[PDB]
């Protein structure tokens, strides 16, 4: 298992514009288009992202290319972030993937906001961190996915995804 296979399981794949769990226009493998309520504004963002007139539909290769970019940006955002970087550097490979997952889903600012949980991960207090991570809107809104990520931090294995 690796970060790409993990996120593909969590986000799924859709080739037509769709609404995410928060009601936002998205496409592909969890690629957020816009928070704006207008489907048209979403189509404009999409064509601009792809570089062609898509009419709201893309191909699998195009979905994977946006995904490759999105994973790369998540990793680079972690390494550039003064709060995230030290946590990432302290973690083993599996747990590094769980943090990438969270950043992909909620963005760098969002994750950096989990100040207490981050300190616990850095300290290698797995069980305590897992309990703290669950006291969040994140967990309450997407419990099945949050549980998978949290178990990954707790055990340092890919068991929740197998
Ligand atoms: Cl883009
Ligand atoms: Cl969920």
From Swiss-Prot:
Keywords, in A-Z order: Antimicrobial, Bacteriolytic enzyme, Cytolysis, Glycosidase, Host cell lysis by virus, Host cytoplasm, Hydrolase, Viral release from host cell
Active site: 11, 20
Enzyme class: hydrolase
Reaction catalyzed: Hydrolysis of (1->4)-beta-linkages between N-acetylmuramic acid and N-acetyl-D-glucosamine residues in a peptidoglycan and between N-acetyl-D-glucosamine residues in chitodextrins
Amino-acid positions noted as binding substrate in the UniProt annotation, renumbered to this chain: 32, 104, 117, 132
Effect after changing residue 20 to A/N/S/T: Complete loss of enzymatic activity
Subcellular location: Host cytoplasm
The protein's Enzyme Commission number: 3.2.1.17
One GO cellular component term: host cell cytoplasm
CDD domains: T4-like_lys
Pfam assignment, any one: Phage_lysozyme
Effect of residue 30 to F: Almost complete loss of enzymatic activity. The enzyme is destabilized by 1.5 kcal/mol
InterPro entries given in the database record: Endolysin_T4_type, Glyco_hydro_24, Lysozyme-like_dom_sf, Lysozyme_dom_sf, Phage_lysozyme-like, T4-type_lysozyme
Any one GO MF annotation of this record: lysozyme activity
Effect of residue 11 to N: Loss of 84% of enzymatic activity
Induction entry: Expressed late in the viral replication.
Family: Belongs to the glycosyl hydrolase 24 family.
Annotated HAMAP family: ENDOLYSIN_T4 (MF_04110)
Free-text function comment from the UniProt entry: Endolysin with lysozyme activity that degrades host peptidoglycans and participates with the holin and spanin proteins in the sequential events which lead to the programmed host cell lysis releasing the mature viral particles. Once the holin has permeabilized the host cell membrane, the endolysin can reach the periplasm and break down the peptidoglycan layer.
Protein name: Endolysin
Organism in which the protein naturally occurs: Enterobacteria phage T4
Lineage, uppermost ranks: Viruses, Duplodnaviria, Heunggongvirae, Uroviricota, Caudoviricetes
Gene (name only): E
């Amino acid at each position: 298992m690796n970060i790409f296979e993990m996120l593909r399981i969590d986000e799924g794949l859709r080739l037509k514009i769709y609404k995410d769990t928060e009601g936002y226009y998205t496409i592909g493998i969890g690629h957020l288009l816009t928070k704006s309520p207008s489907l048209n504004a979403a189509k404009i963002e999409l064509d601009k992202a792809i570089g062609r007139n898509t009419n709201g539909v893309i191909t699998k290769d195009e979905a994977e290319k946006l995904f490759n970019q999105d994973v790369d940006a998540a990793v680079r955002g972690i390494l550039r972030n003064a709060k995230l970087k030290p946590v990432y550097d302290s973690l083993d490979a599996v747990r590094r993937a769980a943090l990438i997952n969270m950043v992909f889903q909620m963005g760098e600012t969002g994750v950096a906001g989990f100040t207490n949980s981050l300190r616990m991960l850095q300290q290698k207090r797995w069980d305590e961190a897992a309990v703290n991570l669950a006291k969040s809107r994140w967990y309450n809104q997407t419990p099945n996915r949050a549980k998978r990520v949290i178990t990954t931090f707790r055990t340092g294995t890919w068991d929740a995804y197998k």
